[PDB]
Design a protein around this nucleic acid. Structure first.
Length: 216
DNA sequence: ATTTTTATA
């Protein structure tokens, strides 16, 4: 299963992509690392096989994700970059060509430290894109035995994962982000994950996540 | 393929 590797600056970046858009980005990163000008491709049949879909559903997912990439940017901590520099197109039936911004390529190759790595198998069943964001941030601090302890500030999560307004007040945050995403990770990944809310007096300031691998 | 990073267990 392919190893997704990226700069920690990307794991921490402010962006908002759908689940399917992040699935495609995983494949783009693998292509970039295994090949720069940024031009990548996606075969519907291969996507369907990787993610366990019919070609019909894969084509629908891919077409919607590629269309919705229009105008999407990533913000590094600011500096903002478009993900794509041309619309995706289809040279052959079942095949799509994309041009990832060449300025984003250094976030995926030539990394010698401060990088995040995980296997595609770890994330390919996640359905919630904010749970994917959280999973990657946990992988960023994962120890060689598969465990880790990660403290994230709540205002940082809101800003970098670009949570909608309906997520940001602490009842909603706890319910819409924390509970759903942690339970999604526990259900659909090899990570076993718990958390504690830390409070500065009255205000809940950060979340301390503790995790282990199901491989124990 | 690799490594440095948070605040903390």
């Amino acid at each position: 299963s392919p190893r997704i590797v990226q700069s920690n600056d990307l794991t921490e970046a402010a962006y908002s992509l759908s689940r399917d858009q992040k699935r495609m980005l995983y494949l783009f990163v693998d292509q970039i690392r295994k090949s720069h000008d940024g031009i990548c491709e996606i075969h519907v049949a291969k996507y369907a096989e990787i993610f366990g879909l019919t070609s019909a559903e894969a084509s629908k997912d891919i077409r919607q994700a590629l269309k919705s990439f229009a105008g999407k940017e990533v913000v590094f901590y600011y500096e903002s970059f478009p993900w794509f520099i041309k619309p995706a197109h289809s040279p052959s039936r079942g095949l799509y060509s994309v041009h990832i911004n060449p300025y984003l390529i250094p976030f995926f190759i030539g990394l010698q430290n401060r990088f995040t790595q995980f296997r595609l198998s770890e994330t390919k069943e996640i359905t919630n894109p904010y749970a994917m964001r959280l999973y990657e941030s946990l992988c960023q601090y994962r120890k060689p035995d598969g465990s880790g302890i990660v403290s994230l500030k709540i205002d940082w999560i809101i800003e970098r994962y670009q949570l909608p307004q309906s997520y940001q007040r602490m009842p909603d945050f706890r319910r819409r982000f924390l509970q759903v995403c942690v339970n999604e990770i526990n259900s659909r990944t090899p990570m076993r994950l718990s958390y504690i809310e830390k409070k500065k007096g009255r205000q809940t300031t950060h979340i301390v996540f503790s995790f282990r691998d199901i491989t124990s």
